[PDB]
Structures are given as C-alpha cells and as structure tokens.
C-alpha cells in the first residue's frame, strides 16, 4: 500500500496536544537541552552526540519511528558505546540523565503531534511545483527546525512558530534541485 496511506494512517491516529500541554512540552525540551550542556561538560566535550543517543533511546518506543526528512543515524554499535559511557556516573549525574531523557521525550511527542499539521500545509501545495509525499519530506524538516529553535520565554505560540518554518521549508524547497 502506497505510504500515502501507510504513513497517513499512522499519524491519523496521533492526537493533537492542548495549548498548554504543548507549551509545557516545548519547555521540557529546553530543560532537557540545558541538562545536555551539563551531561556534556563532564563526560567530555560538547552535546550533540549525547542528544542523538538519548533520542535513539527514546525513539525505541516511539509510536512513529519513520519520519521523512530526518537523517536517522542509528549506528547499531554507537548505542551501547555511549549508553554505557553515561549510565555509570556520579549520584548527581543520574538525575540529569533523567531530565535529558524527558526533555527529549518531549521533543518527540511535540513532533508527532504536529505531523498531521505538516500534512495539511503540504496539501495546500498540491498540483503545483512538487508533489504530496515530496513536500512532506520538507515540511517535516521545518517542523524539526522549529522544535529546535523554539523559545517559550520569548512569548510566541508553538502552533504558529511551527507553521512559520514548515511553510518556509517548503517555499525554500520549491526552488527545486
């Protein structure tokens, strides 16, 4: 069955987050992004490695594992590599791991909750330059840019801050190539 139904069926079973349930998760991401600064400047040098590892750990039980546009870098070996190089740390460094795994579980829920959003924006470009399954690989990519740059303390709403990067990722890809 065309993933036009395989995918769409998966996401059509995901629920939208309440206005404040979102803002709460989007904040939890920043807390699991400040705990990555701590779990990075201790185990040795910068963050992104840790972030992707925890992301894979959480991604193991995700309701939606196949996201078009995301460069899933499993590295079947690197897992136990950094997993062990973390689970064994001082008493205090275990609670920051707890914090990071949650802040990263939020980044996932937040993305899943806005998939059927990227699908309705993409649909507003049908019959044009690019096609359905194509646009989504771009919108979903903007969805990741927003969930990364987001900043509740600034005052913006996420539903909007998302649309303003989903559409932007499509109108910068409509340039083709």
């Amino acid at each position, epitope marked *: 069955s065309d993933p036009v139904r395989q995918y769409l069926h998966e996401i059509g079973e995901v629920l*939208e987050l*309440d206005k404040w*349930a979102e803002l709460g998760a989007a904040a939890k991401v920043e807390e699991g992004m400040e705990a990555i600064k701590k779990l990075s400047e201790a185990t040795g040098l910068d963050q992104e490695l840790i972030r992707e590892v925890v992301r894979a750990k959480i991604l193991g039980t995700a309701a939606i594992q196949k996201i078009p546009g995301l460069k899933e870098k499993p590295d079947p070996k690197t897992v136990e590599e950094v997993d062990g190089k973390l689970k064994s740390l001082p008493k205090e460094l275990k609670r920051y791991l707890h914090i990071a795994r949650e802040g990263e579980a939020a980044r996932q829920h937040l993305i899943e909750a806005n998939l059927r959003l990227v699908v309705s924006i993409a649909k507003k470009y049908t019959g044009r330059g690019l096609s359905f399954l194509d646009l989504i690989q771009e919108g979903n990519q903007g969805l990741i840019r927003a969930v990364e740059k987001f900043e*509740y303390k600034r005052g913006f709403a996420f539903s909007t801050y998302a649309t303003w990067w989903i559409r932007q990722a499509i109108n910068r890809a409509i340039a083709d190539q």
Partner: antibody
C-alpha cells in the same frame, strides 16, 4: 463575577446555517491565555465538545465536524460567535458556552498552568432544534 | 480517539454515604482532568480542576485523585443536593473529550 449567555435561533431548518453568540462579562478575551469554548448536549445524552478560541486567536474544532464549524471573537464587544453550516436534526441539542482560565503567569511567562485544566464557568445554555 | 470511560454509569446511596466515581482514560492525560456536576435542567458546574484541586466555592465534601490514566471523584458525606449526573473531562489533547456520565440516585 463571570457571566456567559448564549443567544440564537430556537429552531433552524435542515441544511441551513446555525449562528450562536456567546455574550459575557467578568472577564475579557484580551486576558492572558483565556479561552472561550462551546459544548453541546443532545437530548438524553452526554456532553460533547465542539470548539474553543483563545485570546491570541488560536482556535480548535472537534474533528467529527470541523468542516462545518467556524468560531470567531469580538474582544471589544465581549462576544464569541460559533457558526455551523449544513445542519441536520442530529445537531438538535442544548448549546453551552464556557470560560477557560488562562495560566497564572509571572506577568508574561507562564508558571502555574494548573487552573487552565477545567472549564470553570458555564452559560445557562440555549436549546436549539433543527427540524422542518 | 482518546476515550474516557466512566464507572459506574449509575448508582444509589443514602444521605451520609461515601462514594467513588472513576474515570479511565484511553491514554495518559497527566493531571489535566476536570470533574463537573450537572443537576437536571442546569449547566454543568466545576468541582475539581487539574485532577485534584477543589474549585473555590465548592463544598469540601468533594475531592479528586489520580494521574495519567486512572482518576476518581469522592463525596465524603452524600447530601440531599448531591444527586445528579457527574461528568469528567480531559484537556490534555484536542479535542477535549467528556466522559459518558454517572447518575447518582438516593435510596429509600
């Protein structure tokens, strides 16, 4: 302090358009994060949620009928309007509007969002019948 | 479709009894659960917000408990005016879903 009153037609004909209005006092839709929502109760049945609109103009509709619902606000007149197209007898019910508290913020940045998890003040309700 | 299952659907008790209504959620809604009371020919009235907080100006016989998936309401001492239908509501996910209702009758 807070009062909401729904108003509109007691009877609309099938396939026509039902326009309900929620007039309120005791709060403003310019208040931080405040929302105003619509709930219906069919005869002899249980509450069903319809739509909600917020101070920042964010709005959400029930999936089973979002194609037929439009919600809009007039924050200077203290009113909210729900519009439902292509009605049918199955839309016969009492329609309620209700108020939703915004988060307790440190003037701007939210912190205590506890009070937002309820619709705390309801209008009296308006009985509306779709029939020929 | 997040489903809110309320039980019992109905029950009888006498003034001064202590009862517990339950609200099970198809999925985790954390603490975003509210409990209302609807008397015949009246709008619902908030009793509990955020799952366990007594709405101000509401009798202290009422209390709520739970988190995630299982919630309960509890009336310490049933009174004459406590006979009505009780509803729960989750506001974690859109659409905010309402439970099916629980009717409460008196014994005699």
């Amino acid at each position: 302090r807070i009062t909401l009153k729904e108003s509109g037609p007691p009877l609309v004909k099938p396939t026509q358009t039902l326009t309900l209005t929620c007039s309120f006092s005791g709060f403003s839709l310019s208040d931080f994060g405040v929302g105003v929502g619509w709930i219906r109760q069919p005869p002899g049945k249980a509450l069903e949620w319809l739509a909600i609109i917020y101070s920042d103009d964010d709005k959400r509709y029930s999936p089973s009928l979002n194609t037929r619902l439009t919600i809009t606000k007039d924050t200077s007149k203290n009113q909210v309007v729900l519009v439902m197209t292509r009605v049918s007898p199955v839309d016969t019910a009492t329609y309620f509007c209700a108020h939703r508290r915004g988060p307790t913020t440190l003037f701007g940045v939210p912190i205590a969002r506890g009070p937002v998890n309820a619709m705390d003040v309801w209008g009296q309700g308006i009985t509306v019948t779709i029939s020929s | 479709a997040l489903q809110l299952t309320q039980s019992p659907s109905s029950l009888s008790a006498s003034v001064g009894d202590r009862i517990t209504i339950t609200c099970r959620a198809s999925q985790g809604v954390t603490s975003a659960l509210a409990w209302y009371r609807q008397k015949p020919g009246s709008p619902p009235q908030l009793l509990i917000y955020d799952a366990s907080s007594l709405e101000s100006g509401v009798p202290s016989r009422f209390s709520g408990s739970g988190s995630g998936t299982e919630f309960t309401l509890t009336i310490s001492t049933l009174r004459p005016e406590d006979f009505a239908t009780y509803y729960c509501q989750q506001l974690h996910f859109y659409p905010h879903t309402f439970g099916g209702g629980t009717r409460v009758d008196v014994r005699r």
